[PDB]
Ligand SMILES: [Cl-]
Ligand SMILES: [Cl-]
Ligand SMILES: [Cl-]
């Protein structure tokens with residue numbers, strides 16, 4: 140490569156693996172959003188929350204691929220596994236699955252940052268810090284906030300709580 | 313007729329029958345809206361939902377009659393039966409009655425489309441596809457969404473749920 | 486299902502298969518665009534052409550999934566295979582691969598339309614006609630136009646022709 | 659020094675050396691731009707590309723000197739060697755010389771970042787990451803893109819290709 144400089148094969152491969160994880164996550168969120176759009180589920184704010192994340196994770200994959208080419212590495216795509224479930228249960232089940240997913244993406248980001256630091260690759264480390272690490276902390280905190288509000292609304296009237304959360308916390312129209 | 317071309321007597325008669333079904337449906341929705349406007353029912357958003365449908369079905373009848381004349385057929389009006397009930401129960405009872413009504417209109421549209429296809433009447437088939445079939449699918453999906461949200465709000469506090477649905481899902485002011 | 490009407494299991498399954506084909510096509514176009522963004526390929530207009538198609542096919546999948554729920558069918562996601570190549574050759578090779586891909590999507594659309602017609606499902610047939618069939622004919626014609634212009638530019642100076650096509654036909658900035 | 663804190667003599671000296679390298683690079687780009695402004699070379703877009711880089715590297719030197727004073731180190735200027743050539747050959751020769759120059763600046767940035775990390779100087783490390791490392795990766799990728807387009811335009815008509823690149827890729831007016 141005419142441009143490649145200080146860009147390890149190990150980082151290049153790890154970035155391709157992270158692209159796969161982000162595209163998997165995008166696909167998971169597409170499925171989550173369409174489940175909440177079912178006529179027998181019908182939680183518009185929950186659907187929009189997950190569709191926005193489907194877009195956000197697709198965009199994250201695109202930013203990683205752009206950076207891979209900026210560094211002179213080679214994008215290599217692998218098959219994308221389907222999401223872990225076909226039906227996602229309640230809003231609570233779905234938000235628990237989402238925070239498990241985000242903690243897995245966050246650990247992959249942290250592992251790649253540690254590899255970049257071991258390889259003395261400061262551009263990689265800055266790239267993750269600037270575009271991914273804080274967005275992940277902010278999203279995980281938001282999902283934690285939502286889990287707490289969903290949990291306080293269960294009481295002995297789960298349907299009422301699930302409606303109210305969707306109506307009064309999540310964005311709809 | 314100086315204009316009539318490729319317009320069967322069978323289609324002409326079926327369009328007149330469909331006009332009757334749409335005017336019946338308009339009348340049903342007028343009754344539903346006035347029931348929810350009673351001082352002892354008093355669900356403004358439910359009343360407005362059904363009054364909008366009373367208008368929409370009157371408009372559908374007018375569009376069918378306009379098309380009948382565009383094709384050179386003859387509008388023939390029949391008596392309009394009163395709605396099936398004088399009192400419509402809860403919002404849930406009313407939305408169940410509405411989706412039964414809309415599935416009956418949808419089946420009549422589908423039957424007329426099948427007659428038009430058998431008669432090789434593409435203008436009729438396009439007319440229904442362009443003005444009626446998707447509006448019916450979209451409305452039935454919306455009513456299904458509403459039925460699911462109404463059902464989740466019943467719990468053991470039916471009055472509370474019925475208020476909240478009207479306040480937080482249906483349009484009022 | 487509380488809403489499902491005139492929606493066959495055969496159509497429901499075929500729509501899920503078509504979603505998979507559109508998401509595969511989106512993924513193919515993501516790969517095509519990133520190949521042309523390589524520092525050793527560097528054809529900005531070619532990259533933008535394929536990235537726009539990656540978005541367009543993702544959007545097509547979303548519209549099919551929205552329609553599946555509008556009809557009361559159930560979205561079912563399957564694994565997504567990786568694209569057929571890791572490296573896409575010249576602009577000519579890539580545009581030939583794209584028109585093969587689009588003819589495969591077009592045949593799948595035509596097969597689903599024929600199934601809908603056999604099942605007397607006019608909403609399905611109108612949906613494909615209104616959102617997919619003309620967009621596919623227009624795109625395939627555009628790709629044919631581009632293939633002809635690329636082919637006339639090869640001459641005995643392939644590099645010069647490939648540059649000029651990207652500069653003077655495809656959109657860049 | 660009344661302000662100096664956590665700022666090693668090693669970093670201070672390395673920053674002064676990097677200032678010299680940036681001012682050398684600015685001077686190289688001044689020479690490159692004036693060569694392409696010759697009446698017997700006459701490639702306006704090539705001249706403007708290199709004059710913009712002459713400004714950019716002067717600005718980089720100024721930012722390093724500002725940071726040196728912010729940290730309480732002392733700017734020390736050394737003689738500036740003349741550029742490596744008086745005549746720069748073709749656009750291809752010149753862009754090859756430019757990417758060699760930029761990889762040398764990038765390695766100096768990476769070496770200073772590694773020194774800062776060894777000295778536990780996070781302000782220095784953040785400063786380079788925020789103002790220099792990504793600007794260098796982006797510029798080197800751009801030069802790689804340009805080298806690929808210049809190389810594809812050589813064919814057996816080098817003059818024609820050199821004109822077309824300057825006219826259709828580089829900014830002029
Ligand atoms: Cl799997
Ligand atoms: Cl009666
Ligand atoms: Cl495969």
Ligand SMILES: [Cl-]
Pocket residue numbers: 739740
């Ligand atoms: Cl010298």
